[PDB]
């Protein structure tokens, strides 16, 4: 996998170039904001079971046929498998936020997942809707202004969002 720093390095090495002054300053800027990054990872990580539970509730309210008999989340084994996938995707998302790069999420979670779901008959469209509900629950938790030093985490929340959206696009 790559993190934000080795991502920049690998693109440079491919051109045989040193990292430019501009790219270095871009990474410094990311270093300056890194407490905020680590808060988001901490907050999402520590509220993982709540984000999964609430997203699942909202998905099934929106899509009740998923868990009526004959639905693909009906029966405890399939419901549990569904919740487990939601947790797994949330975990890879927290890894992308921490490293500041999507590659861990792409390489170890999303690549091949669409194909896995179609071979199984899992409705990818509904998985995508579940991921979006986790996005909303997760960003509300990560960007909560209580119990934290006050400041602007706008770009960071957009970044978090883009990792959830990548997961939605990989299966939807």
């Amino acid at each position: 996998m790559l993190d934000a720093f080795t991502k920049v390095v690998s693109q440079a090495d491919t051109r045989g170039a040193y990292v430019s002054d501009a790219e270095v300053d871009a990474l410094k800027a990311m270093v300056a904001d890194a407490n905020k990054r680590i808060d988001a990872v901490n907050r999402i990580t520590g509220n993982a079971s709540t984000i999964v539970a609430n997203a699942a509730r909202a998905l099934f309210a929106d899509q009740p046929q998923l868990c009526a008999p004959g639905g693909n989340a009906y029966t405890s084994r399939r419901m549990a498998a569904c919740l487990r996938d939601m947790e797994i995707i949330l975990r890879y998302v927290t890894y992308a936020v921490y490293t500041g790069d999507a590659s861990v999420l792409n390489d170890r979670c999303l690549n091949g997942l669409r194909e896995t779901y179609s071979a199984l008959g899992v409705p990818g469209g509904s998985v995508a809707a579940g991921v979006q509900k986790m996005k909303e629950a997760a960003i509300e938790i990560a960007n909560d202004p209580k119990g934290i030093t006050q400041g602007d985490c706008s770009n960071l929340m957009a970044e978090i969002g883009s990792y959830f959206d990548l997961a939605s696009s990989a299966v939807g």
Binding site: L2, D3, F5, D13, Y18, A34, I38, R91, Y95
Partner: protein
Amino acid sequence: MQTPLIEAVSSADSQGRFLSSTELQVAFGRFRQAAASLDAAKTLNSKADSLADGAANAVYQKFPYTTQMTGSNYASTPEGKAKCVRDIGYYLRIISYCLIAGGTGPLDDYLINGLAEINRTFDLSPSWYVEALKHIKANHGLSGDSAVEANSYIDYAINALS
């Protein structure tokens, strides 16, 4: 490619778990040093051509046969010297990447892994590159913790060659 951040994610992922407070503190540690190391990488870029020639000259002094003996693997030709300074530019560039990444990952993945095989197959002596690294170490012109880091990467490369 190993950095403090990737090491933590790889531990967490191999155990199927979310990142710990400790792995978060790893990140703080990495981020506390980062800006002085990023600065170090910029100064190495502005002095790269200068350092690379200086280093290659220091190699031609210490090992005079490399300038005179003919054959593919020596700097007895315009092309031989240009290969040599190129290789030195690679060690320098890849070292600057270690300052950017906060660890030896770029050194391991781009240079060290397979190095012995390369040097053996193309009849290049490791001692040559050890001298070049010694020259780089004595002329980068860095100070503070930037120097101590840069020097750890240079030492790590010398050790792989020995």
